[PDB]
Design a protein around this ligand. Structure first.
Ligand SMILES: *[C@@H]1O[C@H](CO)[C@@H](O[C@@H]2O[C@H](CO)[C@@H](O[C@@H]3O[C@H](CO[C@H]4O[C@H](CO)[C@@H](O)[C@H](O)[C@@H]4O)[C@@H](O)[C@H](O[C@H]4O[C@H](CO[C@@H]5O[C@H](CO)[C@@H](O)[C@H](O)[C@@H]5O)[C@@H](O)[C@H](O)[C@@H]4O)[C@@H]3O)[C@H](O)[C@H]2NC(C)=O)[C@H](O)[C@H]1NC(C)=O
Ligand SMILES: *[C@@H]1O[C@H](CO)[C@@H](O)[C@H](O)[C@H]1NC(C)=O
Ligand SMILES: *[C@@H]1O[C@H](CO)[C@@H](O)[C@H](O)[C@H]1NC(C)=O
Ligand SMILES: [Zn+2]
Length: 598
């Protein structure tokens, strides 16, 4: 029976993968229509088609049991079957599935439709997060103005969806258990195919946490000099509204007030981008150029024809959170980005285009393999290029950085600037999933859900709200990914492995040699490197056809996720900063926040 059955199973899979790709195409189109144009009608259509695809996946899961697939010889066939067994939310009874979709829609559309009143004009009430509130949070140094916008946003994006969030947790848990996972934490973790993955991240995080603490201490010190001791204490958590970002996830927008060497250059090319007439289209064309310069795949015409690369002016509601979309045919790939002409946005364009590249590289795989080796791989691709794009080397080459002298002090300024994004984010990203996992696993009583969030943000990041919160507030959904039910550990994983990829690409490009002071890792530009491009091609073309260690091995010969490379990048900063904090008697660490009343 078995040899013959395995022949038939191969044909079964060939056909089923093609059918899933086509059916997924159709759900993806409806989701795109909604996300690009939020209306009740588009919501209904998206959710109806999802319900129908879920019912089909339920039949597929049932049909896998007609095959003795665990008995087969082919590791590849077994891997595909195992992927089709995994229903996720589709395991839910029809009515629960529909209720979950309705709940998700309610949260994501609440987030996307938030508007607040101008701090200086309570009749102007059409300020959205993107761009209006984000511009104040990144540019204002009026601490009361900042606190105002923080409070208005969190109250509307967060607290307003407590009820919905609670029902989502219940249904997410019910779904996980129907897949025989303990909870949605274990369902998310299953994507890393590694039963020690959490311990591995704890270990890496513990190794980098000392450096974070040094950065935190120095920033707090600098913020005290700017705002004074009535606004920032020496010993307490940093008030998060002063850190240049609504979620304090990255602190690079306050670099001009905390840079190590204020009289030496600090890279900020936004003003030159504007002066040279950059547009969203040009920024996308330049990202395309980067990839094609490395001998990777050019964007196809569908990308240009169907992407939305600037915020519509017609007053519609949409999701502006930047995203990359695979339509599961051939070359139908798209970005939806409310693009602004800034340095940070140039990096975001490259990030999104890394997802597009991945889609193009794996599009010949069977449907079940048309995804990242793990979710962190997907998020890392474009960041590897952004690391290069951010270098003084690259930015001088493209005419955006003028009259730059790369002395020791400018190098520390640039390392610090990078760390304000790359090191600061690590505890932030860990807490987003630690929080959700703790709710999913039933470890926090509902009475303590809000303070459990702020407790994690305190313990790991040493930040706190600008105002006292309580269990009357519900703050976690004020972060897009929490309202949108997007797993966050992918970004922690990305921020570690992107340095492994960057280092290896730099070495292949001839742009990094640890023994050559002329080739430091932090000034490596892989632009134009076919050797780097080759490593990407070898890895990305695999999709999810093999466990992620095999995909890393295809890139650089390694099989282990490791903090060595990110530490190697920041090692000169670590040395300098440890010394600077001692020299300035900077207090390190923080007392427990008083800003969430239990
Ligand atoms: C999550 O875990 C769940 C368990 O906690 C699991 O649910 C179990 O799935 C089992 C596998 O499908 C299912 O097993 C069948 O049980 C039937 C009897 O069940 C009743 O009594 C139970 C308790 O006594 C009740 O709780 C149930 O509700 C039922 O009322 C059996 O009749 C049935 O049998 C047939 O199938 C076996 C297995 O066949 C296999 O494949 C080939 C077929 O060619 C076999 O040759 C091979 O060796 C293998 O056995 C045949 O041997 C047999 O001849 C029959 O055709 C079968 O044992 C079980 O009932 C169910 N239990 C519970 C408690 O729910 C979920 O499936 C898991 N979910 C996921 C997503 O993995
Ligand atoms: C948005 O969707 C609605 C359907 O609810 C449709 O009538 C309208 O034309 C769409 N607008 C745009 C900008 O596509
Ligand atoms: C570019 O990529 C192609 C296809 O992957 C390969 O055959 C070729 O050798 C590469 N060219 C360069 C510039 O190395
Ligand atoms: Zn991404």
């Amino acid at each position: 029976a078995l040899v013959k059955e395995e022949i038939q199973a191969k044909e079964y899979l060939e056909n089923l993968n093609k059918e899933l790709a086509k059916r997924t195409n159709v759900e993806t189109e409806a989701a795109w229509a909604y996300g690009s144009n939020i209306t009740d009608e588009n919501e209904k259509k998206k959710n109806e088609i999802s319900a129908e695809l879920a019912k089909f996946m339920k039949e597929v899961a049932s049909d896998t049991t007609k095959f003795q697939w665990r008995s087969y010889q082919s590791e590849d066939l077994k891997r595909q079957f195992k992927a089709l067994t995994k229903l996720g939310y589709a395991a839910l009874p029809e009515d629960d599935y529909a209720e979950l979709l309705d709940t998700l829609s309610a949260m994501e559309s609440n987030f996307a439709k938030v508007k607040v009143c101008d701090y200086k004009d309570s009749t102007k009430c059409d300020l959205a997060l993107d761009p209006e509130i984000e511009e104040v949070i990144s540019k204002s140094r009026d601490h009361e103005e900042l606190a105002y916008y923080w409070r208005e946003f969190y109250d509307k994006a967060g607290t307003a969806v407590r009820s919905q969030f609670e029902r989502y947790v219940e249904l997410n848990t019910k779904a996980a258990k129907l897949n025989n996972f303990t909870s949605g934490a274990e369902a998310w973790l299953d994507e890393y195919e590694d039963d020690t993955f959490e311990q591995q991240l704890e270990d890496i995080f513990a190794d980098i946490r000392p450096l974070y603490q040094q950065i935190h201490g120095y920033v707090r010190f600098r913020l005290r000099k700017h705002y004074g001791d009535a606004v920032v204490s020496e010993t307490g958590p940093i008030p998060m509204h002063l850190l240049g970002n609504m979620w304090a996830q990255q602190w690079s927008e306050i670099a001009d007030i905390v840079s190590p060497f204020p009289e030496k250059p600090l890279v900020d090319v936004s003003a030159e981008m504007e002066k040279q007439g950059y547009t969203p289209l040009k920024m996308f064309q330049m990202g395309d150029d980067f990839f094609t310069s490395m001998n990777l795949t050019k964007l196809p015409q569908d990308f240009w024809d169907k992407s939305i690369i600037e915020k519509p002016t017609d007053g519609r509601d949409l999701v502006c959170h930047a995203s990359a979309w695979d339509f599961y045919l051939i070359d139908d790939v798209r970005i939806k980005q409310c693009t602004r002409v800034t340095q940070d946005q140039l990096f975001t364009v490259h990030h999104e285009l890394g997802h597009i590249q991945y889609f193009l590289q794996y599009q010949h795989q069977p449907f079940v393999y048309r995804t990242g080796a793990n979710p962190g791989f997907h998020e890392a691709v474009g960041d590897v290029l952004s690391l290069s794009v951010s270098t003084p080397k690259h930015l001088e080459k493209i005419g955006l950085l003028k009259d730059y002298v790369r002395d020791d002090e400018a190098r520390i300024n640039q390392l610090f600037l990078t760390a304000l994004d790359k090191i600061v984010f690590l505890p932030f990203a860990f807490t987003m999933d630690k929080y959700r996992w703790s709710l999913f696993r039933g470890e926090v009583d509902k009475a303590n859900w809000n303070c459990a969030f702020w407790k994690l943000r305190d313990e790991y990041s040493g930040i706190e709200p600008p105002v006292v919160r309580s269990e009357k507030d519900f703050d976690a959904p004020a972060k897009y990914h929490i309202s949108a039910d997007v797993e966050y550990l992918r970004y922690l994983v990305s921020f570690i492995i992107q340095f492994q990829f960057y280092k290896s690409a730099c070495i292949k490009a001839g742009q990094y040699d640890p023994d050559n002071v002329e080739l430091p890792l932090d000034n490596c530009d892989i632009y134009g490197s076919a050797a780097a491009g080759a490593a990407f091609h070898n890895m990305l073309s695999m999709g999810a056809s093999k466990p992620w260690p095999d995909a890393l091995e295809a890139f650089n010969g390694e099989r282990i996720m490791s903090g060595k490379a990110i530490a190697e990048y920041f090692e000169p900063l670590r040395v300098w900063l440890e010394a600077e904090n001692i020299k300035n008697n900077v207090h390190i660490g923080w007392t427990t926040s008083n800003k969430c009343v239990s």
